[PDB]
Amino acid sequence: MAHHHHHHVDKMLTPAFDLSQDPDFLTIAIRVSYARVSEFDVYFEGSDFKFYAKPYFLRLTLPGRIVENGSEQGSYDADKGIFTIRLPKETPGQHFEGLNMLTALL
Structure with a gap:
């Protein structure tokens, strides 16, 4: 049975994100419509x-x-x-400052 494979091959895009937190986790919500x-x-x-x-x-x-x-x-x-995505904080109880001000890095 003969076989044919085909691979299709594009700029990376910065998605909109919102950061929130509780004492235990830092949550990142990324919209990837x-x-x-x-x-x-x-x-x-x-x-x-x-x-x-x-x-x-x-x-x-x-x-x-x-x-x-x-x-x-x-x-x-x-x-x-x-x-x-929920990310557990290394020091629980630690309050992350300046969350709503964070810029995407290149």
């Missing part, structure tokens, strides 16, 4: 945050640190085209 893909990849370390979802890219330096312990929680609303 032009959801070409439904696969979303998140990388975080210390205060560094990176989100990939072609053609969307968003990088942020957070005012505080996030810990890697599998308690982080991602979810997606198709009705609104919104991906939401």
